[PDB]
Design a protein around this ligand. Structure first.
Ligand SMILES: C[C@@H](O)CN1CCN(CC(=O)O)CCN(CC(=O)O)CCN(CC(=O)O)CC1
Ligand SMILES: C[C@@H](O)CN1CCN(CC(=O)O)CCN(CC(=O)O)CCN(CC(=O)O)CC1
Ligand SMILES: [Cl-]
Ligand SMILES: [Cl-]
Ligand SMILES: [Cl-]
Ligand SMILES: [Gd]
Ligand code: NA
Length: 128
């Protein structure tokens, strides 16, 4: 699924992501735009042999199982394939663990370089 801006904000907000660990709802919609282009099916291969999956590009090294990342952890206890669903539940519960882990939203390289220190509220502007 390719999400609209307002449509993804309302879904993230219903899954409780809004002000989670003090990160406003604009920081999250920001990250998804630059990580996936709002596309739940996005995949990207990393040079170490791990792969990032879904709208927040969650990495197979620590967070889920794709059966081809040797001696890696599955700390979300999910197949990576589940992070590719039109239903963003899996991706959101899995991001709640990552953003809590000590480094906050810096785990997302596109958030650090394109959203951190910007007017993030602009990303939910106009939505009901
Ligand atoms: C809502 C309209 O903006 C729709 N829009 C009309 C064309 N716009 C004109 C403009 O943005 O005033 C210029 C192109 N636009 C550049 C950008 O927005 O950064 C990329 C395409 N956009 C992507 C999006 O906006 O989500 C969809 C088409
Ligand atoms: C021509 C405009 O499209 C210029 N635009 C600024 C105004 N936009 C317009 C809008 O989308 O209605 C609203 C804010 N915008 C939200 C979003 O677009 O996703 C984030 C910033 N954008 C990023 C981008 O466009 O890729 C910068 C360029
Ligand atoms: Cl915001
Ligand atoms: Cl594996
Ligand atoms: Cl933090
Ligand atoms: Gd924009
Ligand atoms: Na793994």
């Amino acid at each position: 699924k390719v999400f609209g801006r307002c449509e993804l904000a309302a879904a993230m907000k219903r899954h409780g992501l809004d002000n989670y660990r003090g990160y406003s709802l604009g920081n999250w919609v920001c990250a998804a735009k630059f990580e996936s282009n709002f596309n739940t099916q996005a995949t990207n291969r990393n040079t170490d042999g791990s792969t990032d999956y879904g709208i927040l590009q969650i990495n197979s090294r620590w967070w889920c199982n794709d059966g081809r990342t040797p001696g890696s952890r599955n700390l979300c206890n999910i197949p990576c394939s589940a992070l590719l669903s039109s239903d963003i539940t899996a991706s959101v519960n899995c991001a709640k663990k990552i953003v809590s882990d000590g480094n906050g939203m810096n785990a997302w390289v596109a958030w650090r370089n394109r959203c951190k220190g910007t007017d993030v509220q602009a990303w939910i502007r106009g939505c009901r």
